[PDB]
Symmetry: C2
Subunit: 135 residues, 2 copies
């Protein structure tokens, strides 16, 4: 109360304008039709977890995650794949809150670690560089 | 012929010493019992693809991958999670060959891109930094 985090649920297909607004802030604007299709696919996958930051019923942040297996040990970790706070809600600790809740959520799912990649243009260690090739 | 890449298959549970040797080169030595359990779990997941480099029946490299959905567009990409060439087979283009085959494999699965993180201690762009927190 009254800022909560909760997982995406099917009622959230009635809130696509709010989600579109966040994807725009993320730098990937879209439309409600395509977003509906995409989120339907993502949220029906057992390994993907879309965690939402809610303020007075409005979605004001999202943390899109996937739970992964290590190839090198028998354990699991979480990867944060998308993270955004609404452009009008910045510098008020919501980013900190949504990240902390993402970690807590991951820990409950027995993840040994949480990881993410961020662009170049709290206890997190940066010891890898990302390399991407378009195919 | 006679260097091939192929996916891991169940006959490869008879070659765990070869796989253990690669995990050691990877920096994560293990034993055959635990490795059997781990690879059983990983290879029974529809999204994970363990591609092997084979030379005269011997496993001399591995590329462990997972196929992922973008949160921000309706498409997929591949992540390379583990990549190693046998310590006695270095500087002979096997790394190049196994990477090229990983990309080709990914492209056939309709991946738009292939990505990986590498430590700090060919057409790939490096525009992200990795951040990891232990939980």
């Amino acid at each position: 109360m009254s800022i909560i985090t909760r997982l995406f649920n099917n009622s959230d297909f009635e809130k696509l304008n709010q989600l579109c607004k966040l994807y725009d802030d993320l730098g990937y604007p879209t439309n409600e039709n395509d977003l509906k299709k995409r989120l339907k696919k993502i949220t029906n996958h057992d390994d993907y977890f879309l965690l939402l930051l809610i303020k007075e019923n409005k979605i004001i942040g999202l943390s899109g995650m996937c739970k992964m297996m290590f190839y090198e040990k028998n354990a699991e970790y979480m990867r944060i794949l998308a993270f955004v706070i609404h452009s009008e809600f910045r510098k008020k600790g919501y980013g900190k809150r949504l990240l902390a809740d993402s970690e807590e959520f991951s820990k409950r799912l027995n993840c040994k670690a949480i990881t993410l990649n961020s662009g170049n243009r709290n206890g997190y260690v940066s010891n890898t560089s990302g390399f991407t090739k378009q195919l």
